[PDB]
Design a protein around this ligand. Sequence first.
Ligand code: WTJ
Length: 287
Amino acid sequence: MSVYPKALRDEYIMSKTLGSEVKLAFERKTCKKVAIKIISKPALNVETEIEILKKLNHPCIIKIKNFFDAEDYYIVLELMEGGELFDKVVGNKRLKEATCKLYFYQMLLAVQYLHENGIIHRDLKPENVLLSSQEEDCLIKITDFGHSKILETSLMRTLCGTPTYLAPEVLVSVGTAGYNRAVDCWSLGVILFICLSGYPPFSEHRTQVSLKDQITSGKYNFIPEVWAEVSEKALDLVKKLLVVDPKARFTTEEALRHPWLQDEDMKRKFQDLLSEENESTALPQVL
Ligand SMILES: CN(C)CCNC(=O)c1cc(-c2scc3c2OCCO3)cnc1N
């Protein structure tokens, strides 16, 4: 095969594969577990991923612990013991609605925080949502920022200029510019749909309409049997997220104000989990 870089070996003992690639590792200094993402050599996506993770600071967004640029790229992250949200929804497995809500609330908070900070994720899927423990009441963090974008400066400059020569299509694009972040809200809607129902809104399974046609039409596969079990409030929010027009689509703020999320119990649980995660690092402070 091949060997791990010496600088990596110097600080970590590498262990089992967790997914593929992500490996379990032990930090020598602390004897604590970490996760190490190995990216085969690329530079562009890795450079941005790192610079983004370093600057972001939010409980529902994964933190970077270390970085090694060698034969391959190594990104050292927090270990999320609960693993990927994906494993909870595969094989038509479904989460109970109350659990969906606790996880979705935190997803919303994370994506809201991204957008406030001028970052779009662009590739949000159940496999990029991590769970902090094997308990179903737990914290989630978003990860995998390789496809992210940093927020129209070109257009704005173009607008400050000799309008005389400006091309029609440029002027037309002004109507929609600055709504790229809406793709994350679409992704959140699909993820929420899947968590609630245990099946994807759009797929080629038992249907003759192309996946593409389903998506651009916004006509998701609605199976009343499955959804009978789910509140009308939950379904209403999905509908507002799976809106085809990006300017009309619910923002994270709108989603957070939605009746389905006005749930002080769920919020208390999150706040409880937060404080628990933090006890081990909380210093004393001025009374
Ligand atoms: C690359 N992308 C698809 C996912 C990245 N995954 C992580 O960053 C990550 C994964 C895990 C996992 S996955 C399965 C597990 C596990 O940890 C506990 C044992 O079972 C943990 N931490 C991560 N940062």
